[PDB]
Amino acid sequence: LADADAMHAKALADAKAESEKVTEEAKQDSERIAAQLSEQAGSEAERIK
Amino acid sequence: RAQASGEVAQTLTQADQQLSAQGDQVRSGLESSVDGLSAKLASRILGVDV
Incomplete structure (x- = not known):
């Protein structure tokens, strides 16, 4: 029971850390996608010009 | 876009x-040189100076 309580707390902490890393990578990917699509939009606007 | x-x-x-206007301007110089160009073309076709 003590081991299970400790491991449950550890699993919740690991889930928090994994969520933090996942959302950081998600923000990074959002920035990457936004940059790529803004570059595409700029290229298309320059082509139209 | x-x-x-x-x-x-x-x-x-x-x-x-x-453009439109620029063309009208040029249209003028065009009508000024039309006489000489037509004289040259007539001389060419006739085979001798008009």
Whole structure:
């Protein structure tokens, strides 16, 4: 029971850390996608010009 | 894309007007040189100076 309580707390902490890393990578990917699509939009606007 | 299309459309019309006029200006010089060009062409076809 003590081991299970400790491991449950550890699993919740690991889930928090994994969520933090996942959302950081998600923000990074959002920035990457936004940059790529803004570059595409700029290229298309320059082509139209 | 919409903004670029709108600005290019505005530029085009601006250019259509400017061209139009630029053409009228030139149309004049055109009518000034028409006489000499026609004389040269007539001389060419006739095979001798008109």
